[PDB]
Design an enzyme around this catalytic site. Structure first.
Site, mmCIF file in Angstrom:
data_model
loop_
_atom_site.group_PDB
_atom_site.id
_atom_site.type_symbol
_atom_site.label_atom_id
_atom_site.label_comp_id
_atom_site.label_asym_id
_atom_site.label_seq_id
_atom_site.Cartn_x
_atom_site.Cartn_y
_atom_site.Cartn_z
ATOM 1 N N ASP A 197 0.778 -1.225 0.000
ATOM 2 C CA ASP A 197 0.000 0.000 0.000
ATOM 3 C C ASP A 197 0.820 1.290 0.000
ATOM 4 O OD1 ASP A 197 -1.988 1.897 0.380
ATOM 5 O OD2 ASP A 197 -2.972 0.808 1.997
ATOM 6 N N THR A 198 0.902 1.934 -1.165
ATOM 7 C CA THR A 198 1.645 3.184 -1.307
ATOM 8 C C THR A 198 0.938 4.342 -0.616
ATOM 9 O OG1 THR A 198 0.611 3.634 -3.462
ATOM 10 C CG2 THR A 198 2.749 2.532 -3.478
ATOM 11 N N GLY A 199 -0.344 4.150 -0.314
ATOM 12 C CA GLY A 199 -1.133 5.172 0.357
ATOM 13 C C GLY A 199 -1.116 5.037 1.870
HETATM 14 C C1 LIG Z 1 3.018 5.542 13.469
HETATM 15 C C2 LIG Z 1 2.182 6.792 13.639
HETATM 16 C C3 LIG Z 1 0.867 6.688 12.890
HETATM 17 C C4 LIG Z 1 0.048 7.962 13.032
HETATM 18 C C5 LIG Z 1 -1.306 7.911 12.321
HETATM 19 N N1 LIG Z 1 -1.121 7.840 10.877
HETATM 20 C C6 LIG Z 1 -2.121 7.506 10.070
HETATM 21 O O1 LIG Z 1 -3.240 7.207 10.487
HETATM 22 C C7 LIG Z 1 -1.815 7.483 8.576
HETATM 23 C C8 LIG Z 1 -2.013 8.866 7.981
HETATM 24 N N2 LIG Z 1 -2.711 6.525 7.942
HETATM 25 C C9 LIG Z 1 -2.487 5.995 6.742
HETATM 26 O O2 LIG Z 1 -1.505 6.263 6.049
HETATM 27 C C10 LIG Z 1 -3.535 4.993 6.279
HETATM 28 C C11 LIG Z 1 -3.079 3.558 6.577
HETATM 29 C C12 LIG Z 1 -2.769 3.256 8.053
HETATM 30 C C13 LIG Z 1 -1.413 3.775 8.498
HETATM 31 O O3 LIG Z 1 -0.466 3.735 7.689
HETATM 32 O O4 LIG Z 1 -1.298 4.240 9.652
HETATM 33 N N3 LIG Z 1 -3.884 5.127 4.868
HETATM 34 C C14 LIG Z 1 -5.134 4.929 4.469
HETATM 35 O O5 LIG Z 1 -6.038 4.624 5.248
HETATM 36 C C15 LIG Z 1 -5.429 5.089 2.974
HETATM 37 C C16 LIG Z 1 -6.086 6.453 2.735
HETATM 38 C C17 LIG Z 1 -5.469 7.568 3.540
HETATM 39 C C18 LIG Z 1 -4.198 8.045 3.233
HETATM 40 C C19 LIG Z 1 -3.598 9.033 4.016
HETATM 41 C C20 LIG Z 1 -4.274 9.554 5.117
HETATM 42 C C21 LIG Z 1 -5.543 9.088 5.429
HETATM 43 C C22 LIG Z 1 -6.134 8.100 4.641
HETATM 44 N N4 LIG Z 1 -6.345 3.994 2.676
HETATM 45 C C23 LIG Z 1 -5.888 2.747 2.583
HETATM 46 C C24 LIG Z 1 -6.923 1.650 2.363
HETATM 47 C C25 LIG Z 1 -6.273 0.265 2.395
HETATM 48 C C26 LIG Z 1 -7.272 -0.857 2.702
HETATM 49 C C27 LIG Z 1 -6.696 -2.206 2.328
HETATM 50 C C28 LIG Z 1 -7.664 -0.816 4.166
HETATM 51 N N5 LIG Z 1 -7.826 1.735 1.230
HETATM 52 C C29 LIG Z 1 -9.069 2.174 1.384
HETATM 53 O O6 LIG Z 1 -9.506 2.585 2.464
HETATM 54 C C30 LIG Z 1 -9.940 2.162 0.134
HETATM 55 N N6 LIG Z 1 -10.963 1.140 0.320
HETATM 56 C C31 LIG Z 1 -10.993 0.016 -0.391
HETATM 57 O O7 LIG Z 1 -10.171 -0.252 -1.270
HETATM 58 C C32 LIG Z 1 -12.126 -0.948 -0.058
HETATM 59 N N7 LIG Z 1 -12.855 -1.359 -1.290
HETATM 60 C C33 LIG Z 1 -11.557 -2.174 0.662
HETATM 61 C C34 LIG Z 1 -12.576 -3.264 0.952
HETATM 62 C C35 LIG Z 1 -13.590 -2.851 2.019
HETATM 63 N N8 LIG Z 1 -13.408 -3.592 3.269
HETATM 64 C C36 LIG Z 1 -13.492 -4.917 3.378
HETATM 65 N N9 LIG Z 1 -13.754 -5.668 2.311
HETATM 66 N N10 LIG Z 1 -13.315 -5.498 4.558
HETATM 67 C C37 LIG Z 1 -10.576 3.544 -0.090
HETATM 68 C C38 LIG Z 1 -9.502 4.619 -0.160
HETATM 69 C C39 LIG Z 1 -11.401 3.529 -1.366
HETATM 70 C C40 LIG Z 1 -2.142 9.137 12.684
HETATM 71 N N11 LIG Z 1 -2.014 10.158 11.980
HETATM 72 O O8 LIG Z 1 -2.920 9.063 13.658
#
Ligand SMILES: CCCC[C@H](NC(=O)[C@H](C)NC(=O)[C@H](CCC(=O)O)NC(=O)[C@H](Cc1ccccc1)NC[C@H](CC(C)C)NC(=O)[C@@H](NC(=O)[C@@H](N)CCCNC(N)=[NH2+])C(C)C)C(N)=O
Lengths: 99, 99
Positions: B25-27
């Protein structure tokens, strides 16, 4: 081009004639854009993410330019944390993961 | 290797002596693995995305093999719907997005 991942892979997109910043997300099945006025017919659906489900507007056959590359397909519009370009459009611009 | 995006970019990973399937996941800024009894010290944190936030345990210096590629870094463990390999580890295995 080739994009490394030390920083978020953010690019400029053009949708509805408007420029926005979006994240290339290989973990997203679909493309979700923040609420905006978008020319086209839409239908209400629900999508899921890491923290749960949200309501979004589904727009089909939407013309969108991603980093200069053309794509035309489904764009979901709703309360997403950030604009994300999902696999439905990443495949259209010919994006692949490599290592 | 090269991974196209027609379907979810799932690969086999090894963590804590167990093999699992994970999504490249690049996102995702971080790496989140399904609830597992990983030994060691951890810190409670909250991560979010579409739908909201979830509580996870943050482990530092966790060894993880991704598609045959060794890496070591921070791994979050909690009720994630899918095992996710984020940028913190993707950079370590030299992964890039290309189009
Ligand atoms: C170590 C410190 C962490 C600090 C913490 N950081 C975060 O929360 C950071 C920003 N989050 C992220 O980077 C998270 C992943 C979790 C993570 O890495 O922590 N990324 C994400 O959540 C990104 C979107 C995003 C990007 C940046 C910011 C916010 C949101 N989505 C990733 C996600 C992956 C999926 C497999 C669960 N995809 C989706 O949510 C997409 N959804 C889908 O593809 C659905 N069809 C999946 C099936 C549905 N569910 C099921 N069948 N059970 C949607 C975008 C259409 C904070 N800020 O509180």
């Amino acid at each position: 081009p080739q994009i490394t991942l030390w920083k978020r892979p953010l690019v400029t997109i053009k949708i509805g004639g408007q420029l926005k910043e979006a994240l290339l997300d290989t973990g997203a099945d679909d493309t979700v854009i923040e609420e905006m006025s978008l020319p086209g017919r839409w239908k209400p659906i629900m999508i899921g993410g890491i923290g749960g489900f949200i309501k979004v507007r589904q727009y089909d056959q939407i013309i969108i330019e991603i980093a200069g590359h053309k794509a035309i397909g489904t764009v979901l519009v709703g309360p997403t944390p950030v604009n994300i370009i999902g696999r439905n459009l990443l495949t259209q611009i010919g994006a692949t993961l490599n290592f």
